[PDB]
Amino acid sequence: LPPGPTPLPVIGNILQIDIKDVSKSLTNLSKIYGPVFTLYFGLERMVVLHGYEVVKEALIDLGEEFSGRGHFPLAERANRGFGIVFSNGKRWKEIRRFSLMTLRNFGMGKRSIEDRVQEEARCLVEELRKTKASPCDPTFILGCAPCNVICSIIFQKRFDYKDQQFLNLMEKLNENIRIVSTPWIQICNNFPTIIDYFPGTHNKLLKNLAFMESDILEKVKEHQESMDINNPRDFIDCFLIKMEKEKQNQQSEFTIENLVITAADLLGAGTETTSTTLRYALLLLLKHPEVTAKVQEEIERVVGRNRSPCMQDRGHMPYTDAVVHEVQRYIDLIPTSLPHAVTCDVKFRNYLIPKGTTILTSLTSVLHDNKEFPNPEMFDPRHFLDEGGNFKKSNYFMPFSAGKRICVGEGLARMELFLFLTFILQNFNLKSLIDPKDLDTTPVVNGFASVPPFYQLCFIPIHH
Numbered sequence: 001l002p003p004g005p006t007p008l009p010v011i012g013n014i015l016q017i018d019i020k021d022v023s024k025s026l027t028n029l030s031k032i033y034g035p036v037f038t039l040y041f042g043l044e045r046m047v048v049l050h051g052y053e054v055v056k057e058a059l060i061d062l063g064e065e066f067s068g069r070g071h072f073p074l075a076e077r078a079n080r081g082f083g084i085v086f087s088n089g090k091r092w093k094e095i096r097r098f099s100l101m102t103l104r105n106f107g108m109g110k111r112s113i114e115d116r117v118q119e120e121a122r123c124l125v126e127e128l129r130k131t132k133a134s135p136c137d138p139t140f141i142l143g144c145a146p147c148n149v150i151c152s153i154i155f156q157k158r159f160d161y162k163d164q165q166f167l168n169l170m171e172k173l174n175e176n177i178r179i180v181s182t183p184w185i186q187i188c189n190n191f192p193t194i195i196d197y198f199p200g201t202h203n204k205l206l207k208n209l210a211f212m213e214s215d216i217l218e219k220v221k222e223h224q225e226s227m228d229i230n231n232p233r234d235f236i237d238c239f240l241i242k243m244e245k246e247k248q249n250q251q252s253e254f255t256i257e258n259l260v261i262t263a264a265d266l267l268g269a270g271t272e273t274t275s276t277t278l279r280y281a282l283l284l285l286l287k288h289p290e291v292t293a294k295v296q297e298e299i300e301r302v303v304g305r306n307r308s309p310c311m312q313d314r315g316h317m318p319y320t321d322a323v324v325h326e327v328q329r330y331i332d333l334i335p336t337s338l339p340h341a342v343t344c345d346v347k348f349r350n351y352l353i354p355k356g357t358t359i360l361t362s363l364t365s366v367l368h369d370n371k372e373f374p375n376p377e378m379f380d381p382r383h384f385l386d387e388g389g390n391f392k393k394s395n396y397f398m399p400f401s402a403g404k405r406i407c408v409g410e411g412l413a414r415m416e417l418f419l420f421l422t423f424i425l426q427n428f429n430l431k432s433l434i435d436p437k438d439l440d441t442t443p444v445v446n447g448f449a450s451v452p453p454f455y456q457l458c459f460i461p462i463h464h
């Protein structure tokens with residue numbers, strides 16, 4: 001077992017963590033026990049992997065052994081094993097696969113995935129105009145887009161921003177995210193005893209998911225009725241079709257129950273994540289007009305006025321792609337990614353990690369490597385640009401994590417970020433209330449995810 005601070009009887013290693021910034025806490029601890037150390041929280045023992053070296057040697061090289069999902073008392077209470085985000089064994093590789101392929105640009109019908117995002121970007125811009133250039137909070141708008149995107153990929157179509165169903169869904173998605181991100185929820189995951197004495201909070205979430213899932217099930221039924229085995233409209237159809245195919249083995253991991261959960265998983269996995277990054281991206285663009293202006297020039301060069309942007313233009317716009325990467329590397333949305341777990345006994349280094357041991361990877365240590373990224377604390381699009389000005393990749397770019405568990409929506413997220421942002425910059429100018437040299441882009445890490453400080457900006461139309 002890897003070294004680490006001795007844990008007290010009931011509070012474990014809690015006194016070693018500054019809840020106001022768990023991420024940072026782990027980094028400081030690595031400055032003592034190295035890139036690999038053990039920790040104890042509640043009844044959960046965990047091994048922290050800090051530093052690119054150990055992170056790659058685990059997620060990549062030893063991919064299969066670290067392909068397991070960390071123990072989640074909360075997730076296992078709400079999903080019970082179903083879904084993608086928290087499934088395992090056969091069940092995981094099963095749903096995962098189908099999801100990966102069904103999500104391919106043309107993995108679910110004649111209509112491509114990009115066509116949906118494109119349309120949403122059209123609405124996103126259409127709504128921004130409504131603000132009439134007046135000071136406003138992009139928090140809401142930037143949230144409807146990513147959410148509506150998933151909706152159009154799961155259901156036959158999207159929803160009007162006014163539609164109540166939509167509002168109920170997003171409002172319910174926010175409450176659920178707040179809950180799970182609270183320090184209290186973190187405590188229950190580790191110590192499942194206290195949750196029985198104070199079920200209140202967990203019940204609210206379970207209730208929200210229950211209602212959310214029911215509404216899904218219903219639509220899943222509306223599909224079954226008008227399904228076209230040879231003309232899939234969305235995820236549901238594909239899944240439903242897949243069922244008909246494996247209607248011969250009683251071991252088919254594909255069931256209506258797994259669909260509902262999976263649908264819910266994706267829905268909650270692509271909203272907050274993408275939404276927060278977009279809102280953070282704009283904030284950074286206000287702080288750095290110099291950078292915003294350049295992107296606009298590249299959009300002006302490679303795209304022009306007569307045409308809206310598309311994914312084919314990304315490979316042509318090296319600078320714009322750099323900013324998108326820098327924004328992700330800088331904000332470090334998920335400091336510690338999602339809890340992992342060794343599928344068996346692994347002799348990582350001199351230390352041996354027992355089967356089923358929770359593994360916490362510090363993506364922060366990778367995305368903020370002072371070496372691969374000089375001055376990782378500063379926002380600079382240069383980090384992903386060579387001397388010539390061409391885009392340069394990096395094995396240190398793991399916002400979506402890495403390994404057999406890498407984000408299922410990595411291609412979808414990047415597609416949205418690029419299109420959404422470029423659409424906005426091509427139609428509007430970014431002017432903030434107070435001076436761009438004043439407002440601070442510093443995060444407010446909630447522990448589970450980083451959140452940008454509150455701010456307001458104005459969307460000034462570019463007519464030409």
Ligand code: HEM
Nearest residue numbers: 085269270273274277337338399400401405407408409413
């Ligand atoms: C900019 C936004 C996003 C970021 C930064 C992000 C990041 C990540 C990360 C770090 C993980 C955990 C990987 C691990 O367990 O090692 C993950 C999981 C996942 N994400 Fe995303 N993600 C984003 C958007 C999306 C979107 C748009 C979708 C929906 C299609 C989505 C779907 C998922 C799913 C299904 C998983 C669980 C995968 C598995 O365990 O097999 N994500 N994401």
Ligand SMILES: Cc1cc(C(=O)c2c(C)oc3ccccc23)cc(C)c1O
Nearest residue numbers: 085177180265268269272273334338449
């Ligand atoms: C709590 C929870 C998180 C995620 C998920 O994909 C997220 C990940 C990996 O990071 C996030 C940051 C903000 C909001 C959601 C996520 C996915 C599910 C199914 C959950 O129950």
